[PDB]
Amino acid sequence: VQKAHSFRRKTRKKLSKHPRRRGLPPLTRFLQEFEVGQRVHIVIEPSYHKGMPDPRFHGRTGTVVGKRGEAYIVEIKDGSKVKTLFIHPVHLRPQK
Amino acid sequence: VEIPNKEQILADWEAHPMRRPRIEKVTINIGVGESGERLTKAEIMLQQLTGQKPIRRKAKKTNRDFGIRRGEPIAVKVTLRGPKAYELLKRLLAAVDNRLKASSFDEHGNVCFGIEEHINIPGVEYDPEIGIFGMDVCVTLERPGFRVARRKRKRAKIPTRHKLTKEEGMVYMMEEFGVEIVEG
């Protein structure tokens, strides 16, 4: 039986959280900032349901191309085409 | 009964003034069991006996066997603290003979009993509104610094050394007022 893709389709372990990590995260990730042209990983935080990108892109590295409101604009390369995402910084991580 | 540690624990109470506990609250419950005019009668009874307002304790879950429905006001209760609580406890404990079962004490030196008919400065004014007379009375003790676990800010847990025990509670009751029995 074919099943169409939904937001939380086959994310039982991907969006799960460690038992010792329960609760809200530390505020550093919430309050972090990035600059245009920076490269950032996408690590979704399950406990924060706003500004969440599609779990399809969880674990990918993108480029910051601006910031509207509180969310950052991340440009990513899916296959060969370009996709723009709006992600809250809590879901993002700097690339060292 | 007989407490073997009375002497050295007396040395302890006298040596450490802050180790002396006190009755923080006496709770009196009237389990009326039904939401009728008897409930109001018990409410007014405890109002004129204690002097403060009652509380309508509702029923959790529904049980047809006892003729109760969830959320129905069934029983009432009142909490007494301070010197007025001391006086009320004295008169209530005098109501019945000044004897307490030695086994009724909890693990943390908390004791309580029940009275199946008003007898404490009772007043024969029961025909107008009475009939549900009967009261579960439990007393709680505490060494002074137990508000650490009650205050919201910087709440902490008291160690095992600083909390009461059954023997200390019964000896405190004996020393202050009243006597124990061997309950058989």
Binding site: P19, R20, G23, L24, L27, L31 | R153, K154
Partner: protein, 196 residues
């Protein structure tokens, strides 16, 4: 702890000092926060800014400054003392240069007419503007200290032992509970003269 699935809260939450849910909302603004805290005998007012390594406090004021540097002879845990400390911290912040801040009463309840809001009124009067609504401040007479003087007069009219127990430290320090409003006006005058 019980096992591997036991979640130990943050250190500050375990100690019951910081409300992280409110911390996040306060820090979202990005402006400096005027942190106000109170003890059994003293008040603390500070101006703090965020720093991921650890938040940095720029201007801080303690109520011992009132007793030593400027001269105070009253209990440092009352609404008038809170107002004086708020005025002092506002003047200090304006001297520092910062012009705006947001109040931070920690995990104290927001009950109107309290010491924290007395500090807020003192700061806004000093000049450091903080968003607020005037209805939360304590009464002007309360800030001037009329309540303590009234209680002292009532106690003196009543049995004097109650008055002695209540204010056994003021008399030895050398201050009568009466004329406290005059003492407050004197301290206010010296503060304004020094800072203006």
């Amino acid at each position: 702890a019980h096992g591997p699935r036991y979640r130990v809260p943050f250190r500050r939450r375990r100690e019951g000092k910081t409300n992280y849910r409110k911390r996040l909302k306060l820090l979202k603004s990005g402006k400096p926060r005027l942190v106000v805290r109170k003890s059994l005998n003293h008040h603390i007012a500070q101006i703090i800014v965020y720093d991921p390594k650890g938040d940095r406090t720029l201007v801080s004021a303690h109520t011992r400054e009132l007793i030593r540097d400027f001269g105070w002879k009253g209990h440092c845990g009352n609404t008038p003392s809170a107002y004086l400390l708020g005025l002092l911290i506002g003047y200090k912040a304006k001297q520092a240069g910062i012009e705006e801040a947001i109040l931070d009463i920690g995990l104290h309840p927001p009950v109107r007419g309290s010491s924290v809001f007395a500090v807020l009124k003192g700061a806004v009067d000093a000049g450091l503007n903080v968003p607020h609504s005037p209805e939360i401040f304590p009464d002007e007479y309360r800030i001037r200290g009329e309540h303590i003087a009234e209680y002292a007069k009532m106690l003196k009219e009543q049995d004097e032992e109650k008055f002695r127990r209540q204010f056994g430290g003021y008399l030895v320090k050398g201050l009568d509970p009466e004329k406290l409003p005059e003492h407050f006006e004197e301290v206010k005058a010296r503060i304004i003269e020094k800072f203006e």
